[PDB]
């Protein structure tokens, strides 16, 4: 495919995307809490030694500062790759992201921009992260015109999507599913390559039902697809959304026009979750093809619990049962 590859898990593919970026773009800098020694998930190991202390460095412990600082770097045209240590701690920077980064180009009539900013952050459940190490905040950002929000499902996908975020001329939030950081490795090009933003990927074709998810939850719906085939004789089309905003409306709609049924799943809570935006759009576009109501299989409308995690998450059984009801509707 893309020159020489090597086996990488997700943390290593992130390190490789970042190394590629600082090798080819002399303006690029990487900064945040504890990034200098390699980061608490080891995503920046080696980079300070390779590229210098002025390019990979620790900031003070202040998320509103990190994002404000990165916007300012990007205003000058330099590539700024900010890290927020867990996506749960992105909220102190919410005003800098929503009122500042997202609106920077528009409000200046394109005199100024912070296009060269990317914010990367660990995201999603991790077994025992509880309320503040498990969150999936993408729906809070989906309602903010002017930012992009991108979430990969695997090492190959992560490196391609992150490089696209870094290079894209708009402020981007890149959420890394932390439960995948040391999951199975796969072949990843050593050299840079890009995967397009605002493009969903149909990873398995099918004819009876369309399943949509992102991040780790893609792997859950792939397993649900295999259960439906074996237990029900049902052919499921499985789509990784990849980009939360702007999202690939056309690919999802085309699939649902074919299948007539849609199930969307995400770890984030149901109410106000991004599944509502996908559901209400597909319903408007595909209304005449819908054989059953669009299903949403999500986290409960509660904070993310410590000891009850196994009961909280939208697992393959929850998703299977929902799919079973939808096919019988």
């Amino acid at each position: 495919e893309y020159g020489q590859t090597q086996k990488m898990n997700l943390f290593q593919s992130v390190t490789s995307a970042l190394d590629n970026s600082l090798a080819k773009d002399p303006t690029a800098v990487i900064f945040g809490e504890d990034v200098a020694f390699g980061g608490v998930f080891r995503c920046t190991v080696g980079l300070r030694d390779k590229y210098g202390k002025d390019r990979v460095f620790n900031t003070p412990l202040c998320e509103q500062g990190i994002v404000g600082f990165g916007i300012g770097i990007a205003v000058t045209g330099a590539t700024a790759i900010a890290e927020i240590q867990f996506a749960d701690y992105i909220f102190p920077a919410f005003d800098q992201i929503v009122n500042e980064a997202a609106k920077y180009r528009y409000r200046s009539g394109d005199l100024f921009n912070c296009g060269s900013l990317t914010i990367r952050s660990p995201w999603g459940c991790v077994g025992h992260g509880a309320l503040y190490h498990s969150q999936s905040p993408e729906a809070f950002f989906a309602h903010c015109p002017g930012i992009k929000v991108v979430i990969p499902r695997s090492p190959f996908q992560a490196k391609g999507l992150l490089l696209s975020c870094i290079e894209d001329k708009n402020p981007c939030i890149f959420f890394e599913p932390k439960i995948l950081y040391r999951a199975a490795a796969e072949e990843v090009p050593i050299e840079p390559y890009n995967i397009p933003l605002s493009q969903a990927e149909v990873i398995q074709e099918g004819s009876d039902v369309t399943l949509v998810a992102w991040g780790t939850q893609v792997h859950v719906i792939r397993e649900v697809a295999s259960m439906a085939k074996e237990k029900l004789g049902v052919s499921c089309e499985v789509i990784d959304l990849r980009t939360i905003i702007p999202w690939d409306v056309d690919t999802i709609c085309k699939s649902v026009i074919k299948t007539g049924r849609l199930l969307i799943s995400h770890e984030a809570p149901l109410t106000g979750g991004f599944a509502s935006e996908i559901s209400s759009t597909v319903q408007e576009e595909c209304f005449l093809n819908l054989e059953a109501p669009i299903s949403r299989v999500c986290g409960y409308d509660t904070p993310f619990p410590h000891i009850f995690e196994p009961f909280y998450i939208p697992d393959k059984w929850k998703c299977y049962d929902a799919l079973r009801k939808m096919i019988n509707y």
């Binding site: 500062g65 404000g68 500042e100 702007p246």
Partner: protein
């Protein structure tokens, strides 16, 4: 000797709490008195006549424009305005000390910096009217100015957000060996925001060539400073972050100039932040939405005004007189009125422009919404003010 990594300090064997000294705080640096006389000759910057006349003419032209735009808002011609009365000295004294290409971030009450940099009256006007000439495309409220050519970052309403941003620009400047400073203006109210604490700290730890310039004008809308803080103003906070700090009489253009000039030299040379707190008084209302009589001026307007103080200096030096004052008042009025008339005659921009620049490229779903408005206007256009807008 203490071995703790967190501080460099001796032991002490008596319990003694450090007491803030507020009653006798950081002294206010002043070069000329209210009569425009130099107090200490060794501090006199001895600026050349043509530059001092530029300070003065910039301040008065801004005053002229303020009076006209304020009145234009009261007549319903622009939606909003904020005047700069009493603070015009902090603007031009500091701008005069900068290189043309030093990057400026501001709050909203620093228009004199753009004036000093020769920003055209036409474009101040175009932004307040949101007309076709506005490079901001009419998207923001009046007085939210920006100019890429004159290195003045577009103003935004959320307070203090520009502070950590200016620090990041300063870092990038350091890496590029730009040999330029960033200056970042804000009010004493805005200094209360969490962003100020982030900016100050990041500037010192990351060693950034930046001047933090605080206009302390005694109020944040209705809120007096006794309710804003209990420390010795904003200057007293700088040293705690490791920032070289100074307090200046901001109604004295020379004191402001001298402090900004020295800060700029050292910040760019040493890659180190400086804080200047300019003490002034907010003569006008907070904005055209505020009636300051609801909560509180002529002492300041008549005894200690930056324009009056520099005029006295100019009269004392024989560099200005009544005949020159009279002729300049007249010509600057005429120049502002000419820009004003031209600005009111222009249409507003094409309504399509509400959709571009959200992202660099318009997403397909956003183009679809743009197309939806076009179709909407084809059927219902008579219910919209289309004749005010370019077509």
């Amino acid at each position: 000797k203490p071995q703790f990594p967190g501080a460099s300090a001796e032991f002490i064997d008596k319990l003694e709490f450090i007491q803030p000294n507020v009653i006798s705080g950081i002294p206010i640096y002043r070069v000329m008195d209210r009569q425009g006389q130099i107090i200490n000759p060794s501090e006199d910057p001895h600026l050349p006549k043509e530059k001092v006349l530029k300070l003065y003419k910039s301040m008065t032209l801004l005053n002229t424009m303020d009076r006209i735009l304020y009145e234009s808002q009261r007549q319903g011609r622009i939606s909003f305005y904020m005047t700069n009365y009493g603070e015009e000295g902090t603007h031009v004294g500091s701008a005069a000390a900068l290189d043309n290409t030093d990057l400026v971030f501001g709050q909203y009450r620093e228009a004199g910096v753009l004036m000093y940099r020769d920003y055209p009256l036409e474009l101040f006007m175009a932004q307040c009217y949101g007309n076709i000439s506005d490079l901001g495309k009419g998207r923001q409220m009046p007085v939210h100015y920006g100019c890429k050519e004159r290195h003045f970052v577009t103003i935004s309403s959320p307070l203090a957000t520009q502070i950590p941003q200016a620090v990041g620009a300063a870092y990038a400047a350091k890496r590029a060996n730009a040999n330029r400073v960033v200056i970042c203006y804000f009010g004493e109210g805005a200094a209360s925001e969490g962003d100020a604490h982030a900016g100050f700290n990041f500037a010192a730890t990351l060693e950034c060539p930046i001047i933090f310039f605080c206009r302390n004008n005694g109020y944040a809308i209705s809120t007096p400073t006794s309710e804003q803080y209990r420390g010795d103003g904003i200057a007293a906070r700088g040293p705690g972050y490791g920032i070289m700090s100074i307090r200046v009489d901001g109604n004295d253009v020379f004191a402001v100039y001298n402090a900004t000039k020295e800060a700029r030299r050292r910040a760019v040379a040493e890659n180190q932040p400086f804080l200047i707190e300019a003490m002034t008084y907010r003569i006008g209302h907070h904005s055209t939405s505020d009636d300051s009589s609801a909560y509180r001026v002529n002492y300041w307007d008549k005894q200690d005004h930056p324009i009056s103080r520099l005029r006295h200096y100019l009269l004392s030096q024989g560099w200005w007189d009544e005949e020159q004052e009279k002729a300049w008042r007249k010509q600057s009025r005429r120049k502002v009125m000419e820009a004003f008339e031209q600005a009111e005659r222009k249409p507003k921009p094409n309504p399509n422009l509400l959709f571009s620049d959200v992202y660099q490229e318009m997403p397909a779903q956003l183009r679809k919404q743009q197309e939806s408005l076009a179709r909407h206007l084809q059927t219902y256009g008579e219910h919209y003010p289309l004749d005010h807008f370019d077509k």
